[PDB]
Amino acid sequence: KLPPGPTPLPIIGNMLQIDVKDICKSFTNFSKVYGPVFTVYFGMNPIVVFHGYEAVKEALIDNGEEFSGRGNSPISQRITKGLGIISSNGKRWKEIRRFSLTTLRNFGMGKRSIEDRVQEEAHCLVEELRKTKASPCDPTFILGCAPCNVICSVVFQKRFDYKDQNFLTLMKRFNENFRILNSPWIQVCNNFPLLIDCFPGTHNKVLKNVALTRSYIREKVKEHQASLDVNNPRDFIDCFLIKMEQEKDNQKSEFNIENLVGTVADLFVAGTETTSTTLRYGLLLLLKHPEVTAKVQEEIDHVIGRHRSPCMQDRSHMPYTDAVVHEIQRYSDLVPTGVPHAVTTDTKFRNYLIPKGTTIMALLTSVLHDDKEFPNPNIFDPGHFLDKNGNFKKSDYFMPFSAGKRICAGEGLARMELFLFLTTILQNFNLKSVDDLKNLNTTAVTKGIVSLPPSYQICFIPVH
Numbered sequence: 001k002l003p004p005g006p007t008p009l010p011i012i013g014n015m016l017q018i019d020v021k022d023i024c025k026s027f028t029n030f031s032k033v034y035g036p037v038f039t040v041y042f043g044m045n046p047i048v049v050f051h052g053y054e055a056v057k058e059a060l061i062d063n064g065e066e067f068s069g070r071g072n073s074p075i076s077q078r079i080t081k082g083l084g085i086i087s088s089n090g091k092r093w094k095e096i097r098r099f100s101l102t103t104l105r106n107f108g109m110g111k112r113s114i115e116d117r118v119q120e121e122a123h124c125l126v127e128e129l130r131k132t133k134a135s136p137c138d139p140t141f142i143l144g145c146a147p148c149n150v151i152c153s154v155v156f157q158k159r160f161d162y163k164d165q166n167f168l169t170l171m172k173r174f175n176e177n178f179r180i181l182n183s184p185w186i187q188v189c190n191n192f193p194l195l196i197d198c199f200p201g202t203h204n205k206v207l208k209n210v211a212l213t214r215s216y217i218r219e220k221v222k223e224h225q226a227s228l229d230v231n232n233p234r235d236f237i238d239c240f241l242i243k244m245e246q247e248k249d250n251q252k253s254e255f256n257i258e259n260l261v262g263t264v265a266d267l268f269v270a271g272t273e274t275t276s277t278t279l280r281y282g283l284l285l286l287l288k289h290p291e292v293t294a295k296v297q298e299e300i301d302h303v304i305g306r307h308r309s310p311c312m313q314d315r316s317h318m319p320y321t322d323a324v325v326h327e328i329q330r331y332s333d334l335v336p337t338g339v340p341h342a343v344t345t346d347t348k349f350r351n352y353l354i355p356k357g358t359t360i361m362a363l364l365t366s367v368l369h370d371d372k373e374f375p376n377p378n379i380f381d382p383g384h385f386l387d388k389n390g391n392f393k394k395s396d397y398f399m400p401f402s403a404g405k406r407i408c409a410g411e412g413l414a415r416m417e418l419f420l421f422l423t424t425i426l427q428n429f430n431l432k433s434v435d436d437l438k439n440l441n442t443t444a445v446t447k448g449i450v451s452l453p454p455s456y457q458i459c460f461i462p463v464h
């Protein structure tokens, strides 16, 4: 007995009842008719949707174990093969994530903290923006390089030089597989697999890129193997290799060259375009909101000064900027529908039974936009994370990284990259818009699984 829901048409479920261009709007509308929990069918597939804090929490958190399964999909399986962390489940998942989480702690991979890799990058970033000579530009590409390089310096050792050819194709490929796989069409194709045949070129293009990336990562892992100094790991690959060596006698062990290549790939996928997007969105919101960028730069000046690059320890003494980064994430609403889950076994939810394997969808956006927890949930306002005395006010409704057992495996890095990149930038540049601010649109183009900020141009004017 699944939760209530629209009546499905025998073969295509409720597909033609939901706008694939903005399926979140469709879901919100269904909740107005069926309530917090409801079932909809994408083709033959039943998807139970959780909408609102009470429901999302009850599911993701209170029943975390049952809801910690990754929502399967033909396209994910063909590419990842159940390998790595993003698309794995059960034991293999539990083990890889557990290892990943620890080797991604600030000092979980050697003498060089992750924070220091981010700072080196935040630095190279401003020196690039510096090169645009205050002229108007589309930050998209340049902003996307930073997050990509962070991941590079987290898994491969040192960062790449922005001009490095290897770095640029390794990036244009992820950016390519991203622009393709984030199309509403993939959602359709995932439920009606036959449709993939209607896209031979695109199909080949993806697998082609997945080939080149994987084989490249594999080249790197051999490099890391030849130079492996077990006493002091340089990066994610050294740590994983070290771990392999230990489980060596075990042929059950998930830690093998297979999961390694996948997990590194997963890291690029899971941490590049997301961060990049929130970054662009963030700069855009700061551009549109001059009064906010000002207090941030005032806080930066008052705590960090003009003779020292910001660091994570400062965030503790910068409640406003903290509220700003949280509001940026709360407004960006990067993944409105959250990433699909799947219950691990027959699961009881209130007066409903959800059969093992059923696909779950916890509407993060419904949390992030709770009109009671965040009055005027649709306006960008740091006050949403600020108390009467200007102190940061954490919220339970802050779920942009999801929640429960499967919450973003890189929340820390994500938040770190956002705080260091944004501050390091505002400390060195002022944001000027090409046109009149009123003409500046900040409404997201919520097509596909990841929302994107509208396109825009910006001038980075170095400060004096």
Ligand code: HEM
Binding pocket: 070, 085, 086, 087, 097, 104, 266, 267, 270, 271, 272, 274, 275, 278, 334, 335, 338, 339, 400, 401, 402, 403, 405, 406, 407, 408, 409, 410, 411, 413, 414, 415
């Ligand atoms: C501002 C940027 C980012 C946001 C908003 C974000 C958020 C998310 C979300 C919503 C999920 C899905 C959670 C779920 O299963 O319900 C996720 C998963 C994941 N994220 Fe991120 N992410 C970002 C950056 C990062 C970064 C920088 C890394 C890299 C270390 C990363 C690594 C992962 C991984 C590995 C998973 C899969 C975890 C699993 O399946 O157990 N993320 N993230």
Ligand SMILES: Cc1c(C)c2c(c(C)c1O)CC[C@](C)(COc1ccc(C[C@H]3SC(=O)NC3=O)cc1)O2
Binding pocket: 075, 076, 079, 080, 086, 174, 175, 177, 178, 179, 181, 182, 183, 209, 210, 265, 266, 268, 269, 270, 271, 272, 273, 274, 449, 450
């Ligand atoms: C590069 C990139 C991709 C391709 C991306 C997403 C992000 C955030 C990315 O940075 C979000 C999900 C989605 C838009 C669609 O769902 C998928 C998520 C991950 C994957 C992993 C595949 S894509 C790739 O180049 N290598 C992989 O292992 C496939 C599909 O894919």
Ligand SMILES: CCCCCCCCCCCCCCCC(=O)O
Binding pocket: 075, 078, 079, 180, 183, 185, 186, 189, 196, 199, 202, 203, 206, 207
């Ligand atoms: C194993 C990988 C399989 C990948 C299959 C991808 C199938 C969906 C391809 C969708 C392509 C959409 C192209 C048009 C995009 C647009 O113009 O908006």
